[PDB]
Design a protein around this ligand. Sequence first.
Ligand SMILES: N[C@@H](CCC(=O)O)C(=O)O
Ligand SMILES: N[C@@H](CCC(=O)O)C(=O)O
Ligand code: NA
Ligand code: NA
Lengths: 264, 264
Amino acid sequence: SCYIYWDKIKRIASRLEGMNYHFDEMDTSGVMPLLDEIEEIAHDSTIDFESAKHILDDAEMNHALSLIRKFYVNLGMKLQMEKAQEVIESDSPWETLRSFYFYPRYLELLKNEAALGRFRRGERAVFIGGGPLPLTGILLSHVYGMRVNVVEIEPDIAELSRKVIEGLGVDGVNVITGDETVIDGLEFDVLMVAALAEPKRRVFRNIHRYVDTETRIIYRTYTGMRAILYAPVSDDDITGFRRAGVVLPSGKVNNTSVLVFKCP
Amino acid sequence: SCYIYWDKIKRIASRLEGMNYHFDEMDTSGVMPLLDEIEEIAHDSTIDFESAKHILDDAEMNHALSLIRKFYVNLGMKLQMEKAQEVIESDSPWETLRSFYFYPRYLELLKNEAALGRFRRGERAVFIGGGPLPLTGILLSHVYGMRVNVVEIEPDIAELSRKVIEGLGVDGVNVITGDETVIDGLEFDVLMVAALAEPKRRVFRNIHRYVDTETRIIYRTYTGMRAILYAPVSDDDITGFRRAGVVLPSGKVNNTSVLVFKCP
Ligand SMILES: N[C@@H](CCC(=O)O)C(=O)O
Ligand SMILES: N[C@@H](CCC(=O)O)C(=O)O
Ligand code: NA
Ligand code: NA
């Protein structure tokens, strides 16, 4: 075809490949302009899902797509690690948390998820894939009054997130070190699967093993042009589950949120 | 998976299988309830596009899908034929036209397409694939004040549509007997491609030959669960064009309308 975005994407990828930013080296503040350029294309409302799929599925786009996704994931992770440490050291930990680049979008996302999942105060939530800054975990208690167990696979990352939570004094948010298989030892009303919880198919296979058909499960994915940011969850990934509600994002929110229930 | 809609579809497919009628011979009034059942599923706003695709692409659905499509197309053509002749014989042609099952849906569909295509009074439109009841061509003139040419391949169907237009006393709608290739020698501001214009790949090929890059082209297609009604236009079909706007339907409107321009 002849979409003006094709060349815009290729020019971004050319700069990413050319600079070859290393996780340990990348200056997080210095590459924010690039993140904005990528998000400008991701968040563009005039691009329909058919066209997005046209572009992003093309064999000639594969290399460029892979560069953009790698940069986005690396930059997101680096921002989380930086913010986590800043919160731990801050004279004002909540103020510090609130100035996190993605904080406003997470409020918007979680409000839509809370409606989708009919969250009630006191309910027990598990969040799979906390990372260094377990922001959703934090908000589920601080805004929604839920009792939260966050699951994180990397021991040093899980410990950093404990320190974040302790530095904030958020009520009722615990961190369990391990993979999604630790949910067998937990009792919960709502389960949420982080956009970064991987590998998706194994994750959902394990969830299926341990949950019943009444448990509300929400997962985060990418649809439309926002799929430039990260690979979407596939239908095959959720075998054994039925979709029961979707929230498509608007504004600067990246994720699509999907409610599923386990099939009988 | 375990969608409730799956069993609902199989049930309709078995009622269709149950008929002794051949679909080109069925009584139109007697099968309206089956149409209603199919439309309830197609029009269900709770079914997300990913789930729809899950159900419709499924191997086990191949035959139920083809059967429901064959029924829907045969019914639609029969309703058109019957209505065209009824309008021709009526002492109140406009009243008769307004009683057409899909009439109010077309009012809504065209209103949205008029915004999508930026229609203006006195502009020239070509509609590819009129059939016996050239309702869109009629509305384009009578409501939107456009100067219309309708193209219809079958000589007797084309002649029937001329009689309908005359009976209604609508000015500014001509019918040309021919395929899409007739557009070579016409000057027009917008081209519209009927949902029924076939075969899509050849039709778009020819269009591409005879239009320039500034001409607004709108084609009608099916997305989401509404794909149960008829096969969608593929991206391969539109090679050489870019999408520049999409209207997804709500309510009981079946078609998705897509604005495209030819690529430089
Ligand atoms: N990953 C965070 C959200 C903030 C971020 O994306 O870095 C979470 O666990 O909710
Ligand atoms: N096919 C008609 C509309 C009526 C119908 O769908 O049967 C058209 O060209 O607009
Ligand atoms: Na996190
Ligand atoms: Na028609």
